[PDB]
Amino acid sequence: APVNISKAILLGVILGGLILFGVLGNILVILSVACHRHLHSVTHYYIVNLAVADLLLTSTVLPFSAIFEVLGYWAFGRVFCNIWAAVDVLCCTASIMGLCIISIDRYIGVSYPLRYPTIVTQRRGLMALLCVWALSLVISIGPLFGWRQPAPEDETICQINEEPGYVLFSALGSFYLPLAIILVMYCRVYVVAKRELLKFSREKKAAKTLGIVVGCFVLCWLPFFLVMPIGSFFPDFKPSETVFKIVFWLGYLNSCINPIIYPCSSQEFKKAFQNVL
Ligand SMILES: C[C@H](Cc1cc2c(c(C(N)=O)c1)N(CCCO)CC2)NCCOc1ccccc1OCC(F)(F)F
Numbered sequence: 596a597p598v599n600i601s602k603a604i605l606l607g608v609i610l611g612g613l614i615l616f617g618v619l620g621n622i623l624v625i626l627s628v629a630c631h632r633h634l635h636s637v638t639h640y641y642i643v644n645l646a647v648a649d650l651l652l653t654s655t656v657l658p659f660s661a662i663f664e665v666l667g668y669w670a671f672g673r674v675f676c677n678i679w680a681a682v683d684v685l686c687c688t689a690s691i692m693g694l695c696i697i698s699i700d701r702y703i704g705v706s707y708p709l710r711y712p713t714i715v716t717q718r719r720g721l722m723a724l725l726c727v728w729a730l731s732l733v734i735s736i737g738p739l740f741g742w743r744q745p746a747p748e749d750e751t752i753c754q755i756n757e758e759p760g761y762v763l764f765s766a767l768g769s770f771y772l773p774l775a776i777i778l779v780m781y782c783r784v785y786v787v788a789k790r791e792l793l794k795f796s797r798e799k800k801a802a803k804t805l806g807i808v809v810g811c812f813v814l815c816w817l818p819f820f821l822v823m824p825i826g827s828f829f830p831d832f833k834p835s836e837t838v839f840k841i842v843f844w845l846g847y848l849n850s851c852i853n854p855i856i857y858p859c860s861s862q863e864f865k866k867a868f869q870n871v872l
Contacts, residue, residue, distance in 0.1 A: 623854060
């Protein structure tokens with residue numbers, strides 16, 4: 596079923612423009628931190644980590660996914676699809692884990708604004724960063740490696756694991772369990788901010804910025820992680836393919852958007868972006 600080139604050209608151009616916007620935003624978010632030595636810290640390094648996760652999503656996953664969508668079939672080989680799926684599942688996991696370890700950074704930095712640089716330093720936060728990378732890698736490849744469904748005969752048919760056994764714990768350990776550690780850390784941050792100086796004000800401003808980021812991420816991803824398990828349990832209530840398309844693309848455009856939040860929310864990042872431009 597060769598889709599008309601003219602009809603799908605609009606979709607292809609839209610997806611390409613979104614991917615380029617996300618990529619440029621992600622390089623900008625990293626370049627602002629790197630060039631400016633007035634804007635480096637454990638939380639800023641974690642923001643750069645999230646930017647790198649978005650870069651991995653938008654430089655190795657999006658282009659291929661958009662090509663697959665517009666074409667409608669997987670031109671490349673089986674091994675290439677297997678690596679692409681693993682890269683996707685691990686980059687999303689890396690982004691969410693970065694979020695959940697930014698949720699602890701901004702809980703420590705709000706509960707103890709003055710003693711904060713003592714609990715976490717450039718040597719202690721990096722251990723957590725590497726640990727979360729390792730955890731994301733093992734919880735991403737593991738489900739794929741451990742619970743792969745049999746390889747399809749056709750090279751142009753390569754879709755996600757329909758088996759509930761995988762999807763259940765993959766989603767749970769990739770989104771829901773990391774999401775609990777975010778919703779509890781930010782609940783504590785909010786209650787602390789309400790009940791509760793210059794350092795405290797800066798910490799609360801950074802907490803609010805990262806809270807906007809976390810909210811956007813969670814709201815955008817929740818449709819997919821709520822529909823796919825529901826479809827797994829409830830095959831009778833699986834939505835239309837359009838629903839799947841829109842939810843996946845929302846889960847991607849969230850990473851595409853992520854860069855915009857920093858300039859619009861935090862004035863410091865706004866100056867950094869202006870200087871870099
Ligand atoms: C799931 C998705 C991959 C994907 C799948 C399919 C596409 C596309 C596309 N738009 O190119 C992308 N289709 C295109 C239409 C064909 O004609 C048909 C099917 N990656 C997002 C992120 O996934 C997880 C990231 C982290 C944890 C769980 C995830 O869930 C995977 C699941 F198996 F659990 F659902």
